[PDB]
Nucleic acid binder design. Structure first.
Length: 121
DNA sequence: CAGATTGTGGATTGAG
DNA sequence: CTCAATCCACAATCTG
């Protein structure tokens, strides 16, 4: 357990994918857009990059984009979230000891910004 | 071609 | 109890 923002990785990835131009994003583009939106990874640790890559494959919300039907074994494909399938309790703010008080720092729920067309600060 | 990155997924941990 | 976070491993493409 390392210092990460109190939002599930699923909601973090789902946000940057919807906030993107064509609602598709490559792994690297997901990595840097997540890092700047939730600026709590600019330190020494690096394993959070794996956790995101692992979350994309291990969730049925995220699907790949087929570049070439002749090479379906290709990598670097853009990922697309399918918002309707995101459990509503996965977007709420994570109950940790960091959010015992002073919670006014972070929003309570990312559903408006993910599936309701609102702007995240 | 070596080294970096992607995609997958099996297994353990700490915490709620 | 449960489950997100983290670990570590392997396979295979991607890049220069």
């Amino acid at each position: 357990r390392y210092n990460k923002p109190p939002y599930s990785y699923l909601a973090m990835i789902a946000l940057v994918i919807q906030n993107s131009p064509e609602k598709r994003l490559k792994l690297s583009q997901i990595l840097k857009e997540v890092s700047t939106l939730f600026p709590f990874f600019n330190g020494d640790y690096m394993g959070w990059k794996d956790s995101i890559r692992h979350n994309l494959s291990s969730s049925d919300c995220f699907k790949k984009i087929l570049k070439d039907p002749g090479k379906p074994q290709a990598k670097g494909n853009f990922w697309t979230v399918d918002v309707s399938r995101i459990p509503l309790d996965a977007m709420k703010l994570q109950n940790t000891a960091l959010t015992r008080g002073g919670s006014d720092y972070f929003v309570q729920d990312l559903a408006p910004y993910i599936l309701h067309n609102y702007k995240y600060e």
